[model samples]
Target: VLKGKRLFAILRLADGSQPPFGASVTSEKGRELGMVADEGLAWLSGVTPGETLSVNWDGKIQCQVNVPETAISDQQLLLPCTPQK
Candidate 1:
C-alpha cells in the first residue's frame, strides 16, 4: 500500500495450461483473494485502509503480459481500476 491507496502489478507467468481461469491472489499470510482479470485487474472490495496485496496468475493467452503498478487514491466512493489492453 502506498499513500492510502492499494497498489497492484501483474507478473507474466503463463504455462499454456489455462486462460485467465487459473489466476489467484494471496496475502503474505496465505489468504487467497481471487483471480486476476485478463487485463490483470482484480476485484478489490471494502478496503478502508491500504495494505499489501499480491497476485499469482497461471494460464494461457495469445501472449503473456505484466501490468505496471498503479495507484488510485482519495476513493470517497468505491471505484475499480484496470490495465488497458
Candidate 2:
C-alpha cells in the first residue's frame, strides 16, 4: 500500500489525454519515482507536493508536472507536453 506522503499524484497530458501508459517519472532531485501504470498512472513515492519533475515517454517527448500538495493518490496531475525539437 502506498503511504500518504508517497501518494502525491497521477500524471496526464496537455491534450487532456494520458500518455502511452508506461512513462517514467524523475524528480527534480533525480529520484526515480517509477513508471506509469496501464492507465498512465505514476506513483510519486517520497516526493513532496508542489515539487517539480519531468516525465518522459520514450525519448520522443518529455513534459513537466507540478506535484500538488493534495495527498490524493488518484488525482490527475497534468504534465503539459512541450513538443520535441
Candidate 3:
C-alpha cells in the first residue's frame, strides 16, 4: 500500500519502445525483482510485501503505472502522454 505518501502513477513504456524505457523496482536490499512487462506491468514473485515500489519514466512518453503492494490497492497510474508544444 502507498501509505504515508500518496499513491503515485508511473506509465512505464512497454513493448520495448525506447531504450531507457523500462521498470526498475527493488526492495531495501539490492535485489532484482523483474523489469516491468512490455506494457509497464510487472508481477514478480520476489517483490517484498509492503515494500516501497518506485518507478522511473523513459522521459519519452507520459505514462503512469499504479503498482501497490497488493492487487486490491493497485491502480493504473497514467502519465497522460501528449506531444510537446
Candidate 4:
C-alpha cells in the first residue's frame, strides 16, 4: 500500500523568481527526491506530514522545504530559496 502524501513544491528566489534551471530537492538525510522543472516546480511523493527537507542549487543549500498534511492536488508548498547566481 502507498504511504505518506504527495506534494508539489515550488522553488523561488528571494525576489519571487525562479532559478535558471537544475535545482534539486533532498531530505535532511541526503536522500535525493526530486528536481525542479523549468517552471520551478517539482512533484514530490511519499512525503510524511511535517517532514523537513532542504532545497539546494549549485552545490549549496538554498532553503528549507516543509511538507504539510495537505496532498499535492490540494495545495503546493512554497519554498523561498536563494538560487545560484
What are the RMSDs of all candidates, in order?
9.2, 3.8, 9.0, 3.9
lDDT tens readout by residue for model 2, 1-85:
4544354345777667654466667765766665677676776566555666667786524676556665344444444433333
Top of the candidates by lDDT: 4
Per-model tally of clashing residue pairs: 1, 0, 11, 0
Per residue, candidate 3 scores C-alpha lDDT tens digits across 23-76 of 554433544343455564543434433444444445522332233455222433
RMSD of 4: 3.9
Model 2, C-alpha of 6: deviation from truth (Å): 3.5
lDDT of 4 by residue, 1-85 (tens): 4453555667676677663256667768864556676677866554455555667666556665555565344347666554434
Task: Kindly list the per-residue Cα lDDT of model 1 for residues 1-85, writing each as its tens digit.
Answer: 5454443333233442222434454444544333556555444332333433344444222333322233344332221221223
Q: Model 3 residue 81 lDDT?
A: 22
Model 4: pairs clashing at backbone N, Cα or C within 3 Å: none
TM of each candidate vs. truth = 0.33, 0.63, 0.37, 0.59
Query: Residue 7 deviation, candidate 2, in Å?
Result: 2.9
Q: Put the candidates in TM-score order, highest first.
A: 2, 4, 3, 1
lDDT of each: 0.36, 0.58, 0.38, 0.60
By TM-score, the best candidate is 2
Candidate 1: deviation at residue 17, Å? Answer: 20
